[PDB]
Design an enzyme around this catalytic site. Structure first.
Site, PDB file in Angstrom:
ATOM      1  NE  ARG B 128      -4.152  -2.060   1.999  1.00  0.00           N
ATOM      2  CZ  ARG B 128      -4.143  -2.873   3.054  1.00  0.00           C
ATOM      3  NH1 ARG B 128      -3.301  -2.659   4.064  1.00  0.00           N
ATOM      4  NH2 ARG B 128      -4.976  -3.893   3.113  1.00  0.00           N
ATOM      5  CE  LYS B 150      -0.754  13.651 -14.585  1.00  0.00           C
ATOM      6  NZ  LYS B 150      -1.101  14.142 -15.946  1.00  0.00           N
ATOM      7  CD  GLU B 192       7.363  15.638 -22.943  1.00  0.00           C
ATOM      8  OE1 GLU B 192       6.689  16.683 -22.996  1.00  0.00           O
ATOM      9  OE2 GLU B 192       6.833  14.520 -22.848  1.00  0.00           O
ATOM     10  CE  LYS B 248       5.716  17.139 -14.689  1.00  0.00           C
ATOM     11  NZ  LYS B 248       5.968  15.769 -15.272  1.00  0.00           N
ATOM     12  CD  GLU B 258      -4.109  16.260 -15.934  1.00  0.00           C
ATOM     13  OE1 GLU B 258      -3.537  15.225 -15.536  1.00  0.00           O
ATOM     14  OE2 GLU B 258      -4.003  16.675 -17.106  1.00  0.00           O
ATOM     15  NE  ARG B 262       0.749  16.673 -13.300  1.00  0.00           N
ATOM     16  CZ  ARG B 262       1.497  15.959 -12.464  1.00  0.00           C
ATOM     17  NH1 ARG B 262       1.167  15.819 -11.189  1.00  0.00           N
ATOM     18  NH2 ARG B 262       2.613  15.402 -12.916  1.00  0.00           N
ATOM     19  CG  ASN B 266      -1.721  15.499 -21.303  1.00  0.00           C
ATOM     20  OD1 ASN B 266      -2.605  14.842 -21.878  1.00  0.00           O
ATOM     21  ND2 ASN B 266      -0.711  14.926 -20.665  1.00  0.00           N
ATOM     22  CG  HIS B 269       1.229  14.868 -24.015  1.00  0.00           C
ATOM     23  ND1 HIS B 269       1.982  16.000 -24.245  1.00  0.00           N
ATOM     24  CD2 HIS B 269       2.063  13.967 -23.447  1.00  0.00           C
ATOM     25  CE1 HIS B 269       3.221  15.788 -23.836  1.00  0.00           C
ATOM     26  NE2 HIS B 269       3.295  14.561 -23.352  1.00  0.00           N
ATOM     27  CG  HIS B 273      -0.508  10.199 -24.731  1.00  0.00           C
ATOM     28  ND1 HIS B 273      -0.933  10.776 -23.552  1.00  0.00           N
ATOM     29  CD2 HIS B 273       0.812   9.938 -24.567  1.00  0.00           C
ATOM     30  CE1 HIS B 273       0.083  10.852 -22.710  1.00  0.00           C
ATOM     31  NE2 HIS B 273       1.153  10.348 -23.300  1.00  0.00           N
ATOM     32  CG  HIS B 285       6.317  10.289 -24.680  1.00  0.00           C
ATOM     33  ND1 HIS B 285       4.961  10.056 -24.722  1.00  0.00           N
ATOM     34  CD2 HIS B 285       6.484  11.431 -23.976  1.00  0.00           C
ATOM     35  CE1 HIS B 285       4.333  11.016 -24.071  1.00  0.00           C
ATOM     36  NE2 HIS B 285       5.235  11.863 -23.608  1.00  0.00           N
TER      37      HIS B 285
HETATM   38  N1  NAD Z   1       5.297  10.272 -15.493  1.00  0.00           N
HETATM   39  C1  NAD Z   1       5.420  11.382 -16.272  1.00  0.00           C
HETATM   40  O1  NAD Z   1       5.147  12.501 -15.832  1.00  0.00           O
HETATM   41  C2  NAD Z   1       5.926  11.218 -17.750  1.00  0.00           C
HETATM   42  C3  NAD Z   1       6.268  12.466 -18.416  1.00  0.00           C
HETATM   43  C4  NAD Z   1       6.695  12.289 -19.775  1.00  0.00           C
HETATM   44  C5  NAD Z   1       6.981  11.098 -20.397  1.00  0.00           C
HETATM   45  N2  NAD Z   1       6.646   9.901 -19.633  1.00  0.00           N
HETATM   46  C6  NAD Z   1       6.865   8.521 -20.080  1.00  0.00           C
HETATM   47  O2  NAD Z   1       8.318   8.424 -20.227  1.00  0.00           O
HETATM   48  C7  NAD Z   1       8.574   7.289 -21.114  1.00  0.00           C
HETATM   49  C8  NAD Z   1       9.759   7.604 -22.036  1.00  0.00           C
HETATM   50  O3  NAD Z   1      10.885   7.802 -21.240  1.00  0.00           O
HETATM   51  P1  NAD Z   1      12.392   7.995 -21.811  1.00  0.00           P
HETATM   52  O4  NAD Z   1      12.352   8.650 -23.165  1.00  0.00           O
HETATM   53  O5  NAD Z   1      13.241   8.495 -20.741  1.00  0.00           O
HETATM   54  O6  NAD Z   1      12.727   6.446 -22.143  1.00  0.00           O
HETATM   55  P2  NAD Z   1      13.536   5.188 -21.435  1.00  0.00           P
HETATM   56  O7  NAD Z   1      13.456   5.215 -19.983  1.00  0.00           O
HETATM   57  O8  NAD Z   1      13.110   3.977 -22.133  1.00  0.00           O
HETATM   58  O9  NAD Z   1      15.086   5.549 -21.801  1.00  0.00           O
HETATM   59  C9  NAD Z   1      15.459   5.765 -23.240  1.00  0.00           C
HETATM   60  C10 NAD Z   1      16.625   4.837 -23.645  1.00  0.00           C
HETATM   61  O10 NAD Z   1      17.891   5.328 -23.248  1.00  0.00           O
HETATM   62  C11 NAD Z   1      18.641   4.361 -22.420  1.00  0.00           C
HETATM   63  N3  NAD Z   1      19.314   5.272 -21.491  1.00  0.00           N
HETATM   64  C12 NAD Z   1      18.690   5.925 -20.434  1.00  0.00           C
HETATM   65  N4  NAD Z   1      19.508   6.778 -19.854  1.00  0.00           N
HETATM   66  C13 NAD Z   1      20.717   6.625 -20.506  1.00  0.00           C
HETATM   67  C14 NAD Z   1      21.981   7.262 -20.338  1.00  0.00           C
HETATM   68  N5  NAD Z   1      22.212   8.285 -19.531  1.00  0.00           N
HETATM   69  N6  NAD Z   1      23.047   6.750 -21.078  1.00  0.00           N
HETATM   70  C15 NAD Z   1      22.781   5.780 -22.015  1.00  0.00           C
HETATM   71  N7  NAD Z   1      21.617   5.178 -22.323  1.00  0.00           N
HETATM   72  C16 NAD Z   1      20.611   5.658 -21.483  1.00  0.00           C
HETATM   73  C17 NAD Z   1      17.614   3.404 -21.921  1.00  0.00           C
HETATM   74  O11 NAD Z   1      18.135   2.124 -21.621  1.00  0.00           O
HETATM   75  C18 NAD Z   1      16.624   3.393 -23.106  1.00  0.00           C
HETATM   76  O12 NAD Z   1      16.962   2.546 -23.947  1.00  0.00           O
HETATM   77  C19 NAD Z   1       7.255   7.027 -21.878  1.00  0.00           C
HETATM   78  O13 NAD Z   1       6.791   5.755 -21.487  1.00  0.00           O
HETATM   79  C20 NAD Z   1       6.358   8.175 -21.470  1.00  0.00           C
HETATM   80  O14 NAD Z   1       4.975   7.841 -21.521  1.00  0.00           O
HETATM   81  C21 NAD Z   1       6.058   9.965 -18.378  1.00  0.00           C
HETATM   82  O1  CRB Z   2       1.146  16.140 -15.964  1.00  0.00           O
HETATM   83  C1  CRB Z   2       2.260  15.721 -16.435  1.00  0.00           C
HETATM   84  O2  CRB Z   2       3.314  15.642 -15.767  1.00  0.00           O
HETATM   85  C2  CRB Z   2       2.240  15.279 -17.938  1.00  0.00           C
HETATM   86  O3  CRB Z   2       1.181  15.935 -18.633  1.00  0.00           O
HETATM   87  C3  CRB Z   2       1.941  13.762 -17.874  1.00  0.00           C
HETATM   88  C4  CRB Z   2       1.928  13.157 -19.317  1.00  0.00           C
HETATM   89  C5  CRB Z   2       1.465  11.710 -19.236  1.00  0.00           C
HETATM   90  P1  CRB Z   2      -0.291  11.501 -18.897  1.00  0.00           P
HETATM   91  O4  CRB Z   2      -1.082  12.240 -20.081  1.00  0.00           O
HETATM   92  O5  CRB Z   2      -0.527  10.020 -19.001  1.00  0.00           O
HETATM   93  O6  CRB Z   2      -0.657  12.053 -17.585  1.00  0.00           O
HETATM   94  C6  CRB Z   2       3.307  13.362 -19.931  1.00  0.00           C
HETATM   95  O7  CRB Z   2       3.459  12.712 -21.088  1.00  0.00           O
HETATM   96  C7  CRB Z   2       3.583  14.889 -20.098  1.00  0.00           C
HETATM   97  O8  CRB Z   2       4.863  15.083 -20.718  1.00  0.00           O
HETATM   98  C8  CRB Z   2       3.550  15.581 -18.733  1.00  0.00           C
HETATM   99  O1  CRB Z   3      -6.581  -0.921   9.431  1.00  0.00           O
HETATM  100  C1  CRB Z   3      -7.599  -1.649   9.161  1.00  0.00           C
HETATM  101  O2  CRB Z   3      -8.684  -1.199   8.732  1.00  0.00           O
HETATM  102  C2  CRB Z   3      -7.411  -3.189   9.383  1.00  0.00           C
HETATM  103  O3  CRB Z   3      -6.388  -3.429  10.347  1.00  0.00           O
HETATM  104  C3  CRB Z   3      -6.942  -3.708   8.003  1.00  0.00           C
HETATM  105  C4  CRB Z   3      -6.747  -5.260   8.053  1.00  0.00           C
HETATM  106  C5  CRB Z   3      -6.124  -5.716   6.741  1.00  0.00           C
HETATM  107  P1  CRB Z   3      -4.387  -5.286   6.546  1.00  0.00           P
HETATM  108  O4  CRB Z   3      -3.601  -5.968   7.766  1.00  0.00           O
HETATM  109  O5  CRB Z   3      -3.970  -5.950   5.264  1.00  0.00           O
HETATM  110  O6  CRB Z   3      -4.190  -3.829   6.532  1.00  0.00           O
HETATM  111  C6  CRB Z   3      -8.089  -5.896   8.387  1.00  0.00           C
HETATM  112  O7  CRB Z   3      -8.075  -7.227   8.265  1.00  0.00           O
HETATM  113  C7  CRB Z   3      -8.531  -5.465   9.820  1.00  0.00           C
HETATM  114  O8  CRB Z   3      -9.774  -6.100  10.155  1.00  0.00           O
HETATM  115  C8  CRB Z   3      -8.684  -3.943   9.886  1.00  0.00           C
HETATM  116 ZN    ZN Z   4       5.058  13.725 -22.363  1.00  0.00          ZN
END
Ligand code: NAD
Ligand code: CRB
Ligand code: CRB
Ligand code: ZN
Ligand code: NAD
Ligand code: CL
Ligand code: ZN
Lengths: 390, 390
Positions: B128, B150, B192, B248, B258, B262, B266, B269, B273, B285
């Site tokens: 959790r 996120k 980005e 950001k 969001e 926020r 996007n 996107h 997407h 991406h």
């Molecule tokens: N959570 C968010 O807010 C958010 C925001 C934007 C994008 N994303 C997600 O991010 C993902 C894309 O991430 P990404 O472009 O970083 O890709 P990735 O994590 O796959 O990394 C890109 C590639 O570079 C390699 N690599 C990484 N760092 C390196 C380094 N310093 N030196 C050498 N090789 C390196 C990795 O092994 C990989 O092959 C997507 O799935 C997208 O949806 C999420």
């Molecule tokens: O709120 C964010 O951080 C983003 O909008 C989050 C999106 C992914 P989401 O559309 O699945 O939230 C990401 O691709 C973008 O670059 C930044």
């Molecule tokens: O915090 C709670 O609500 C509980 O301790 C939560 C447990 C499950 P957990 O040990 O996986 O959190 C439950 O079985 C119990 O009766 C009540």
């Molecule tokens: Zn993005």
């Protein structure tokens, strides 16, 4: 007539007779406005209670334009559904609708703790979180599982290892659902009620001891056409349930993410979950918690913290409701035909307890009925735990 | 020397050169005290950067008694790992350790957005919720993915449909990781950066237009033994990255889950997407976001909201960095040999966009470079969207 209870700064718990028939649909359409309602329930319950709700729903949605849709999903009952597979199935189904269920979706959990835990967890991660409401149908859910926001699935290794804290927008406790609850399930739920009384009030615990006979008889009695199962004990039943709900609400409100005080609701669960991991799905959760409570009380006595007279009193109260008090119980033996909890397997399962601090196991210790040793679970040595399981 | 940025009321972002080599291990052991550290990275990165860290770690853990353990998990690189299966694999592995990883576990995400998103989501539901820290290794992660909390996995139906908002305890931005980043990945991350500038500051956008040549040359140049790839442009590079990170941080701080503002992050996107769901994993991406930005700018011009001169300016800035600006781009064609985005498939994918209100699609509309039409995504009719994709 409707009793309201606040939790985490919000008046989200509504309890009364008949909420499902003429209250929930209307309240949902107004307080949880949305274009998409998703109802999740299991096959046992679905066939009995969804029909009248679809009706009540369409009646209230008609008023609205455009009218909201109600999508229903029926799952297999039992602990087996609290799995990764079932979670993925519900998600894929929701994402497959036309149009897809989006972030405005309101999920409705209609069922006991299995459905509540699974549905709450789905809701918590769907597009990163959507609103959901709990409609507990078992005694255990009304008094415990539907309140607090803890959700989770199991894995082959054990109980509730993956999940999230995600509070429901509303919690509707309709005592009318108990009319159809099987006797074994009802008794199963009393274990959480007894557990809640034991960590909070000697008085409430006494009340449970005094109404055992009256309650048990109403539950086992044959009901004639026209009369209600809990005919003359509604007030007694309602009081016991609200007492449990209120105390849980206070505790969750004081320590939502379990940094301390919330550990107390896990009394009997350190040993209870270790047992359940092995005996599920033949043995229910409350039945495992019952055995766990006796074992943990014994451990507290072993540590010189709890009086022996207190332990005997807990055992007799559990026995008075028909709950098992040992792994040697006759039922446990026949229902789990070909299953044994060895001390080592149990100790292994306890290393997975979520309350543990690194390798240190933590157990809730009672100093007296209604009085915890500390306002959190205490560190206990493996050696001490082993002597109580031997 | 270390630049610190606050987000959501906490000073959790630390940026500088060399943090990984001589800062992270020590800071983890003191600010994120725990018995168990779990490092998740992919095979490309693991072999290059884990070694020196294991060392730095043991050196700092030695001081402590009992000494904390460091468990390492190496995953397959790429969008393919952002799946339910990989999440379950990491969980099972963590629960299998001896003793099992518990709630005190500190997870370390060492990698780009794929590793960050997957690891953050695992952390969010493990028992959790457990603490995690982000150590972005790609340009895209430093400036965008590692900040904000996120997390998510994909499903065959589309991008980031299941996930959670879970903030990391620390975010370490070590610019030294860029030394080994492949050229295509670096350019991918600029999308980005450009997107962030376009929704916040004409000035920053101008700065990006003016440094394109200088940056692109350093990135493509052959580095001699002894010299650094970004030899004379460190100050320029650092400024561009921090500008993106800061904006950001401000946005996430103002609307974490969001509800409105926020949505702006996007931009590009909604269409991006929808395209990625079809072209992944061949097309990255940022490359999909680049095309999505041009298409969404065109949509804004179509709606009389954005100036045509503004659209051309966005296209030339993206082209200046080597990013694609249309589905007809030569590369897109050869890399996705045997893959086409029909208008209908795209419209279908857009119905799954998480910003949508019921059946109403919502897109971020720019009124000018650096000026959003509204402080949220706007409702746009399907007909209008179709004309821009035709
Ligand atoms: N959570 C968010 O807010 C958010 C925001 C934007 C994008 N994303 C997600 O991010 C993902 C894309 O991430 P990404 O472009 O970083 O890709 P990735 O994590 O796959 O990394 C890109 C590639 O570079 C390699 N690599 C990484 N760092 C390196 C380094 N310093 N030196 C050498 N090789 C390196 C990795 O092994 C990989 O092959 C997507 O799935 C997208 O949806 C999420
Ligand atoms: O709120 C964010 O951080 C983003 O909008 C989050 C999106 C992914 P989401 O559309 O699945 O939230 C990401 O691709 C973008 O670059 C930044
Ligand atoms: O915090 C709670 O609500 C509980 O301790 C939560 C447990 C499950 P957990 O040990 O996986 O959190 C439950 O079985 C119990 O009766 C009540
Ligand atoms: Zn993005
Ligand atoms: N999240 C929490 O805080 C929490 C608290 C305690 C227990 N739990 C979890 O709760 C689960 C057990 O829940 P449960 O005992 O409610 O089981 P359950 O949901 O499986 O329901 C018990 C059985 O009764 C049937 N049933 C339900 N309501 C009925 C009704 N009114 N009429 C007729 N049949 C009905 C069901 O189909 C089922 O077969 C366990 O998985 C346990 O770990 C979680
Ligand atoms: Cl999950
Ligand atoms: Zn329980």
């Amino acid at each position: 007539n409707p009793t309201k209870i606040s939790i985490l700064g919000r008046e989200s718990i509504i309890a009364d007779f008949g909420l499902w028939r003429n209250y929930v649909a209307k309240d949902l359409i107004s307080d949880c406005s949305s274009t998409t309602y998703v109802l999740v329930t299991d096959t046992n319950i679905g066939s009995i209670y969804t029909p009248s709700f679809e009706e009540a729903f369409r009646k209230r949605a008609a008023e609205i334009t455009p009218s909201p849709r109600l999508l229903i999903y029926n799952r297999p009952p039992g602990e087996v559904s609290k799995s990764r597979q079932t979670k993925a199935d519900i998600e894929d189904w929701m994402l497959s609708q036309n149009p897809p269920c989006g972030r405005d979706t309101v999920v409705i959990a209609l069922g006991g703790g299995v459905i509540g835990d699974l549905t709450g967890f789905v809701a918590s991660t769907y597009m990163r979180g959507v609103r959901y409401v709990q409609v507990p149908t078992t005694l255990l859910a009304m008094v415990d599982s539907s309140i607090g926001g803890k959700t989770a699935i199991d894995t082959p290794l054990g109980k509730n290892l993956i999940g999230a804290i995600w509070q429901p927008t509303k919690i509707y406790i309709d005592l009318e659902f108990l009319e159809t609850l099987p006797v074994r399930e009802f008794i199963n739920g009393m274990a959480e009620v007894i557990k809640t009384a034991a960590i909070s009030s000697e008085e409430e615990f006494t009340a449970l001891e005094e109404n055992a006979e009256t309650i048990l008889k109403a539950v086992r009695r044959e009901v004639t056409p026209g009369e209600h199962r809990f005919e003359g004990t509604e007030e007694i039943l309602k009081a016991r349930i609200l007492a449990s709900a209120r105390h849980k609400a206070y505790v969750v409100s004081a320590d939502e993410r379990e940094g301390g005080l919330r550990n107390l609701l896990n009394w009997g669960h350190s040993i209870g979950h270790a047992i359940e991991a092995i005996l599920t799905p033949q043995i229910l959760h409350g039945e495992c918690v019952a055995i766990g409570m006796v074992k943990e009380a014994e451990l507290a006595r072993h540590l010189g913290i709890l009086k022996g007279v207190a332990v005997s009193r807990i055992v007799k109260c559990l026995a008075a409701y028909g709950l098992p008090t040992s792994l040697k119980d006759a039922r446990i033996r026949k229902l789990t035909a070909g299953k044994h909890c060895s001390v080592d397997q149990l100790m292994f399962n306890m290393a997975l307890d979520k309350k543990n601090d690194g390798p240190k196991k933590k157990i809730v210790l009672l100093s007296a009925i209604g009085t915890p040793y500390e306002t959190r679970a205490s560190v206990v040595a493996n050696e001490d735990i082993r002597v109580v399981l031997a």
